[PDB]
């Protein structure tokens, strides 16, 4: 199969061939707008292993995100408080740029549901992501038993509640001693369990 060969091609990003491709594609994406439908995935193998199928109801949106950190949206200086909170410049955002990308893509395309997303290019000021979206009402989707899980109401707006891969990579959840601070549902659930008095009837 050619998908394996494409996989090592895309893992050899510093090669002159892939570097030329990435430069040209980045220039074209920069010339385009910030949020536009792609006709088809740029990386078919990566889309397939992220869950994309060549069926009616799967669309791909190519989207652009501005690069860098996050400065505190406070007037000119004036972070009124103790000196531990005077910083405004070198702050960093808790979610990833990929998460922000798929979040705003799913916000714009409100009737579709986000599956996943992947990296297609970047330069000094933008990053470019392709987001897979599924129409949960097209019958080729609703009649397929292995993909009608996403048509349930509980999976509405995955990317905003942080249930896709990009959002999950930032909630600090996982097995073992490295992830003690998230036992239970999440960080907030762990905190709520730990900071709660259990007053039995007999104490």
């Amino acid at each position: 199969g050619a998908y394996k060969y494409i996989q090592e091609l895309w893992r050899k990003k510093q090669s002159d061939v892939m570097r030329f491709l990435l430069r040209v594609r980045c220039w074209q994406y920069r010339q385009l707008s910030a949020l536009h439908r792609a006709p088809r995935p740029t990386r078919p193998d990566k889309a397939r292993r992220l869950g994309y199928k060549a069926k009616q109801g799967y669309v791909i949106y190519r989207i652009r995100v501005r690069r860098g950190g996050r400065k505190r949206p406070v007037p000119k200086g004036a972070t009124y408080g103790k000196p531990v909170h005077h910083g405004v410049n070198q702050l960093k955002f808790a979610r990833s740029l990929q998460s922000v990308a798929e979040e705003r893509a799913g916000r714009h395309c409100g009737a579709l549901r986000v599956l996943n997303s992947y990296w297609v290019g970047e330069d000094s000021t933008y990053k470019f992501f392709e987001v897979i979206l599924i129409d949960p009402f097209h019958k080729a989707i609703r009649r397929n038993p292995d993909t009608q899980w996403i048509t349930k109401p509980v999976h509405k707006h995955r990317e905003m509640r942080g249930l896709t891969s990009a959002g999950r990579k930032s909630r600090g959840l996982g097995k073992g001693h490295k992830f003690h601070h998230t036992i239970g549902g999440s960080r907030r659930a762990a905190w709520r369990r730990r900071n709660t008095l259990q007053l039995h009837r007999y104490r």
Partner: protein, 59 residues
């Protein structure tokens, strides 16, 4: 590509303008090492007109 790497192919026609080139960029070298003759043809549209579909990358 699986036929070529099994050496079950006798010649390979590759369209010249696949819009990600990466899907075929590796194929001439693979064809050379397997010793399968390959040619590059103008037009994925007219190449996929051979089959009864809109487009085809290689035959």
């Amino acid at each position: 590509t699986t036929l070529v790497e099994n050496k079950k192919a006798q010649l390979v026609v590759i369209a010249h303008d696949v819009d990600p080139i990466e899907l075929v960029v590796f194929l001439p070298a693979l064809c050379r090492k397997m010793g399968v003759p390959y040619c590059i043809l103008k037009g994925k549209a007219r190449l996929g007109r051979l089959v009864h579909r809109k487009t085809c990358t290689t035959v």
